[PDB]
């Protein structure tokens, strides 16, 4: 460990005793592993704690019941409500339903965490180091990195350990340090010592902290600290979780839960304002104080009833349940609420290279110049065999094997490929295959040089490791590479400044080797390499070249082309400024065209099928890439974005064509175009911006850093598992499988969550409206009170509890993917659904009021009150003045109240079965499709029986029930609500709107 940034780069190398150009030795790693251990963290991976995870109570709807539980305990502390023990029970039926949902919520989330960590553990984090094993570079498991060895980082990488920067190989080096210092914008680094030992992490501008990403550039450094000695390691538990998330679904639910909290506020204020006239009845006893307080209780007890306290839990359950299902499809949900958003997505933007395609590349076609005779131009087209990164294959011309060394243009094409290249070939001795190091594109050139072998290097008797970079090491032995002009997405090309390695002649040898996008390089080509000679770039030549390039990119091979050129007379080293890269394009002028290579890059096997499925789900797909349009168009046709013969005149644009359009037609283009090529990281970020300006939910799929702005901007970023860390950090979901078909299943799961969330709402609204209607109806018609504040708080515990939450386990509808996606501007509750809520709640209230009233009449055991509703309270005690009041006092009886109660419990259990699907009949979506619901109902019902028959309990809640004759009655009344809602489903089942 070196806790020093105040020390210079030489002082840091001296600290561990390492050479910058060799690295650590096997013995040195053995010893440093004993001393410093592995590079990893032991425990508590975003695990929270046992009791502090259940402290998620801090939701508004839940908070209300908490305060309600206190004032229900405060009034109880006075022993009020004309009762002793049941007063202390009131706050506990409230706590129980909260404890219930809080447990299920926590229970589900812990499973999501345990599914995620099992998947991240299936693919180890990696890092690149230089050790004395090889002259070359080797990347290892991030855990096998020790304080001392020389580590290499680059664009899109995640910094594996706390590293003192040694050499910044690029013009600039920017780092995303948001995870540690909060610095949003990318941060520049350097290599000079920071003498202050006490300097804060923000000022350590010569350090690379672990867990952070490289925004731009390439750098070499030395590891100071690993494992827990890492800066981010010291703050593992402290600041465990910090994120930003406010999804559209969450926003709608917050707006819903807010205004819904306002109606219940008024109703319960109304409830208290209405029955302020029964303030003095001989039951409560004329005590005005104990009159308004009782109805303050029923108002609060009704609030608790009406309020969906399970809403924060059912949201939590569905999301965590969704995160787990996606984890089974090898997807990593980096944000629970984001699963819901991918359900109501209308358009999906996608990167091409490495996202829609496999990014497994290989040069299979290439041409140079044959002859230029006036208006006549001819090329030497070549075919190369071998599609893997292996150096076994042959160069062909008209299907005949050819020594590449004979053609001089091929010697130069092989030279530009070898030098103007930052990648290499490693032969994995444990996998037994040739793997790439760096970009797949540049690597495709590396293997080409090997297959060409223009200098005929003996390779028949080499090892499989030596064979990897033989023909390339020959060219590097020949040419000393002075420095590299970076690849810039503005000029879309790069170059190396090279002189003869042996330095045989200073005057004779000096070249700049350029490769990049054809149209750019060729436009800057003033000469054309014919053989070993040189001729001026003319119209016909440029036409003939670009014609064959078009022949390849549009062809059924779908080729990826790079033009190769050499600036014959480059500027002097001191005539060039390497600080900025904006000057680099002019350095790549006066070029001499050498040749063009064409790459193979097959679309992923399941892309075409996935795209076609989205088209059936009302979802549009837009390809966005920095590659050629002609090539990009022919891919869209092959994967189902365009037809084989679609007219794409105004549905495919380039970066220049797009920008040439007014901001009006720039925005309009995004509504019809499905292919944008030759674009920028900003373009990708703006195409999403334009799509979002149409009130559409947008998803972005990428793998590179050029996607990061677009990935962050979209409602859902989706990065490939084989993609970059920057892309993954920018996205909310990661396809670790690289399976594009998962995006399809993530949409189906996303819509299924929205539906179950609706069924939760429809249930708790339609049912609880009945709870409101019940109290409002008995009062309006001058009937005895149906419910007691404790009875209101019991039905709430049992009907708003688990049967509510179990709705989050509903199987999705059968036609869930055949319907168009839901508009973002849709009301959470439609105009028609609000009618269903009332129709059910209307009957429910009526059904449960007629319950208590029936006891007063047609019940044989109950005393009769004749016909035409003779219910008035004048009798009371000593009915001296009355109308046919043979009975002394029928009021304040426990029996009629339990009748109204048991109906509610049964009738609200009933439409929970109706809440299995929005429109599907119970004949196609039976009760046993959601077993968790049946369990809740069984429990909830059996929990009702226990209260009625275990005798220390019916004293607490005023009730006494007949064993059979009453249960038969409440069933006759409850079951029709299943019938009623069934009618309403059939109504929308035959009339399809929505
Ligand atoms: N390493 C390299 N050296 C020189 N030129 C390169 C290069 N890599 C890419 N290019 C050229 O730059 C152009 C744009 O690169 P860019 O990264 O912006 O788009 P891209 O197609 O390579 C990634 P994607 O297709 O996933 O959007 C490419 O079309 C290619 O012709
Ligand atoms: Ca409730
Ligand atoms: Ca890419
Ligand atoms: Ca209810
Ligand atoms: K995003």
Author numbering: 1 to 994
Provide text from the study.
The Ca2+-ATPase of sarco(endo)plasmic reticulum (SERCA) is an ion-translocating ATPase belonging to the P-type family of membrane transporters. It pumps cytosolic Ca2+ ions across the sarco- or endoplasmic reticulum (SR/ER) membrane at the expense of ATP, a vital function in all living cells, particularly in the context of muscle contraction, Ca2+ signaling, and cell survival. Binding and hydrolysis of ATP is mediated by SERCA’s cytosolic “headpiece” which consists of three roughly globular domains, the nucleotide-binding (N), phosphorylation (P), and actuator (A) domains, while the Ca2+-binding sites are located in the transmembrane (TM) part of the protein, which consists of 10 α-helices (M1 through M10). Glu340 is a centrally positioned residue in the P1 helix at the interface between the phosphorylation domain and the cytosolic ends of M3 through M7.
In this study, we have determined the crystal structure of yeast-expressed rabbit SERCA1a mutant E340A at 3.2-Å resolution in the Ca2E1 form with bound ATP analog (AMPPCP), and we examined its functional properties, including ATPase activity and Ca2+-binding kinetics. Notably, unlike other structurally characterized mutants, SERCA E340A is catalytically active, i.e., capable of completing a full catalytic cycle, albeit with altered kinetics. The E2 to Ca2E1 transition of E340A is significantly slower than that of the WT, with an increase of t1/2 of about threefold. Nevertheless, when superposed on the C-terminal transmembrane helix bundle M5 to M10 (residues 750 to 994, main chain rmsd = 0.49 Å), the E340A mutant and WT have an almost identical arrangement of the remaining transmembrane helices M1 to M4 (main chain rmsd = 0.56 Å), with a small 1.6-Å bend at the cytosolic end of M3 in E340A, and a slightly more kinked M1 helix (105° in E340A vs. 109° in WT). In line with this, the Ca2+-binding sites look identical in WT and E340A. In contrast to the almost identical arrangement in the TM domain, there is a pronounced shift (approximately 10 Å) in the position of the cytosolic headpiece, which is rotated further “downward” toward the membrane surface in E340A. Intriguingly, the downward rotation of the cytosolic headpiece in E340A is an extension of exactly the same trajectory as the movement of WT SERCA when it shifts from empty MgE1 to the Ca2+-bound E1 form (Ca2E1): when Ca2+ binds to WT SERCA, the entire P1 to M3 network moves upwards relative to L6-7 and M5, by about 4.5 Å, while the overall headpiece rotates down toward the membrane surface. While the P/N body moves as one rigid body the distance between the N and A domains increases in E340A.The main chain rmsd of 1.4 Å for the N/A body is the largest rms deviation measured for any element of the two structures, indicating that this is the largest structural change induced by the mutation.
